Design an enzyme around this catalytic site. Structure first.
Site, PDB file in Angstrom:
ATOM      1  N   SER A  45      78.578  75.944  26.303  1.00 43.16           N
ATOM      2  CA  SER A  45      77.709  76.766  25.476  1.00 43.16           C
ATOM      3  C   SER A  45      78.425  77.265  24.217  1.00 43.16           C
ATOM      4  CB  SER A  45      77.122  77.911  26.278  1.00 43.16           C
ATOM      5  OG  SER A  45      76.484  77.448  27.468  1.00 43.16           O
ATOM      6  N   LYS A  47      77.406  75.749  20.716  1.00 43.99           N
ATOM      7  CA  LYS A  47      76.321  76.334  19.944  1.00 43.99           C
ATOM      8  C   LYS A  47      76.798  76.804  18.570  1.00 43.99           C
ATOM      9  CE  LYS A  47      72.987  77.917  23.416  1.00 43.99           C
ATOM     10  NZ  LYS A  47      73.638  77.716  24.712  1.00 43.99           N
ATOM     11  N   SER A  60      71.584  82.295  24.940  1.00 40.54           N
ATOM     12  CA  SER A  60      72.271  81.078  25.352  1.00 40.54           C
ATOM     13  C   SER A  60      71.268  80.001  25.768  1.00 40.54           C
ATOM     14  CB  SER A  60      73.279  81.358  26.443  1.00 40.54           C
ATOM     15  OG  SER A  60      74.169  82.400  26.064  1.00 40.54           O
ATOM     16  N   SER A  88      79.962  83.234  25.280  1.00 45.70           N
ATOM     17  CA  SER A  88      80.396  82.801  26.595  1.00 45.70           C
ATOM     18  C   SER A  88      79.984  81.349  26.817  1.00 45.70           C
ATOM     19  CB  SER A  88      79.844  83.689  27.674  1.00 45.70           C
ATOM     20  OG  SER A  88      78.478  83.377  27.916  1.00 45.70           O
ATOM     21  N   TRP A  96      79.693  78.407  30.417  1.00 51.48           N
ATOM     22  CA  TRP A  96      79.972  77.955  31.769  1.00 51.48           C
ATOM     23  C   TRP A  96      79.503  76.510  31.906  1.00 51.48           C
ATOM     24  CZ3 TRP A  96      78.952  81.392  36.726  1.00 51.48           C
ATOM     25  CH2 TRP A  96      79.419  80.714  37.850  1.00 51.48           C
ATOM     26  N   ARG A 146      83.919  86.932  33.085  1.00 49.46           N
ATOM     27  CA  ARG A 146      84.548  86.429  31.873  1.00 49.46           C
ATOM     28  C   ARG A 146      84.616  87.528  30.810  1.00 49.46           C
ATOM     29  NH1 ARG A 146      80.416  81.980  31.159  1.00 49.46           N
ATOM     30  NH2 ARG A 146      79.434  83.517  32.551  1.00 49.46           N
TER      31      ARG A 146
END
Ligand SMILES: *C(=O)[C@H]([C@@H](C)O)[C@@]1(C)CC(S[C@@H]2CN[C@H](C(=O)N(C)C)C2)=C(C(=O)O)N1
Length: 236
Positions: free
Chosen positions: A46, A49, A89, A180, A182, A219
């Site tokens: 992600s 982006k 996200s 962030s 994942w 995180r």
């Protein structure tokens, strides 16, 4: 250097392999339980982006005002601007943006700016999710450092727009920007928390191994704890 010890002590709790990299424009510093992660390439997931928004706005494939409408196919079931989609996200929004850019333009833009290994394969809307695009934590931290300074090879107003999509919070007049990530599609799974603090700028990148069932908020909690111990972003 008890600050360093205080930081290392934080990672004594974390069982997962993790590195945290900081960049102040001169010095790269590395903390965590497996420092070799900093020079290893992983999928951006992600965090891609950021580059996606940049390339897209740069090449007139979207604006920051444009609404990416939901197509009714099933959380993310609503309309989003690129900025709204960044903080939510929303992958399908950025998949659509990737498809607007197309594989030829995406490839040449990643090559132009030297993002990671600059590989997109054949699927233009999955390469950051499943590979083959990979990037080292050190590359990410330098990337976002330049974004903060407006020194990426993009139009200045494009950088400003994407920069402010990453805005998270301020303490006094110190500003945190962060994204962030994942990556679940790969093995092992990778977790990201990349961003910077604007006082001078300190870019940072958490990069750690993830497993199914892990705490999604770890995180950010970890990164903020580290930034506080470093004195880069004190708690209020
Ligand atoms: C990108 O990093 C990642 C993409 C690939 O989906 C993203 C947006 C998912 C998550 S975690 C999110 C929380 N609950 C969801 C879930 O359990 N699934 C599998 C549907 C996913 C993140 C993140 O950074 O936390 N990023």
């Amino acid at each position: 250097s008890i600050i360093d010890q205080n930081v290392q002590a934080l990672f004594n709790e974390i069982s997962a392999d993790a590195v945290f990299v900081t960049y102040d424009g001169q010095n790269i510093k590395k903390y965590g339980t497996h420092l070799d992660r900093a020079k290893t390439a992983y999928i951006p997931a992600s965090t891609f982006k950021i580059a996606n928004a940049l390339i897209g706005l740069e090449n007139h494939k979207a604006t920051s005002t444009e609404i990416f409408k939901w197509d009714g196919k099933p959380a993310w079931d609503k309309d989003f601007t690129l900025g709204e989609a960044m903080q939510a996200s929303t992958v399908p929004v950025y998949q659509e943006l990737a498809r607007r850019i197309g594989p030829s333009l995406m490839q040449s833009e990643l090559q132009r700016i030297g993002y990671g290994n600059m590989q997109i394969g054949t699927e233009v809307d999955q390469f950051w999710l499943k590979g083959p695009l990979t990037i080292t934590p050190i590359q990410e931290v330098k990337f976002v450092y330049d974004l903060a300074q407006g020194q990426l090879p993009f139009k200045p107003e494009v950088q400003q727009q994407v920069k402010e999509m990453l805005y998270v919070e301020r303490r006094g007049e110190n500003r945190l920007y962060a994204k962030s990530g994942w990556g679940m599609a790969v093995d092992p799974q990778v977790g990201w928390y990349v961003g910077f603090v604007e006082k001078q700028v300190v870019a940072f990148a958490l990069n750690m191994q993830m497993k199914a069932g892990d705490d999604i908020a770890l995180r950010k909690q970890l990164s903020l704890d580290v930034l506080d111990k470093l004195g880069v972003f004190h708690y209020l």
